[PDB]
Amino acid sequence: EADNQIMGPSSYASFVVRGENLVTAVSYGRVMRTFEHFMARIVDSPEKAG
Amino acid sequence: EADNQIMGPSSYASFVVRGENLVTAVSYGRVMRTFEHFMARIVDSPEKAG
Q: Are residues B23 and A39 in contact, defined by beta-carbon separation less than 8 angstroms?
């Protein structure tokens, strides 16, 4: 072997239902991953070619 | 007649798809009326007896 250990994530990443996600969860029942990121890509700077 | 005119509204009470509804407009095609009311209900104090 060239190594005996590898670094990595220690705990599971927490992806939780946030608040605007909770609103669209109750109303229509369809939750996206990153709702604030969709807001930043749509209603803040839509012309920004990401 | 007890009155000759009635004091009524002068313009249409406007409502357009603003920022927070627009994400649900594009991703779902599900726009609600007064998204701010739903966010004030089921996010900030859902314990509030309506």
A: yes
Q: How was this structure determined?
A: cryo-EM
| Among the partner residues A23, A27, A32, nearest to B27 by beta-carbon distance | A32
Which is it for the CA torsion A40, A46, A47, A49, positive or negative? Answer: positive
Instruction: Specify whether the CB–CB gap between A44 and A50 falls below 8 A.
Output: no
Interface of B with A (CB under 8 A): 19-20, 22-24, 26-28, 30, 32, 35, 38-39, 42-43
Give resolution, Å, one decimal. Answer: 4.2
Output the six-digit token pair for A12: 């599971």
Closest Cα to residue A25, out of B44, B30, B16?
B30
